[PDB]
């Protein structure tokens, strides 16, 4: 469950994106929290999260869209050994993508 940012200015910032198989999926804002972003910076050697920001701050995405949410302690190495747990009933529009700001 690879992750990566996009469309920021700088690496550690952007749209979140995560792997599953050979095509990579968009991340619900309603579905991440602090905790798991936490978890993405630092896989990514970003530090840690400062912010999460809503509503395809940096451009929306396109394709599938994570119906599992990662419920993340804060304190794990990578996103692929957080607890999952499915989404809320529905699906999202793109528009609510969301994306992270991660600082050391």
């Known amino acids: 469950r690879s992750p990566r940012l996009v469309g920021g ?11 599953h198989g050979d095509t990579w999926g968009t991340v619900c804002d309603s579905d991440f929290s602090l905790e798991a972003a936490s978890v993405l910076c ?21 394709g599938q869209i994570w119906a599992e949410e990662f419920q993340c302690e804060g304190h794990e ?13 529905g699906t999202c529009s793109h528009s609510r993508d969301v994306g992270v700001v991660c600082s050391t």
């Open 9 to 19: 200015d700088i690496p550690c910032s952007g749209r979140v994106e995560v792997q």
């Open 42 to 62: 630092r896989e990514l050697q970003c530090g840690t999260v400062v912010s999460l920001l809503g509503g395809a701050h940096f451009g929306e995405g396109s």
């Open 77 to 89: 190495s990578h996103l692929s050994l957080c607890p999952v747990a499915p989404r809320p009933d």
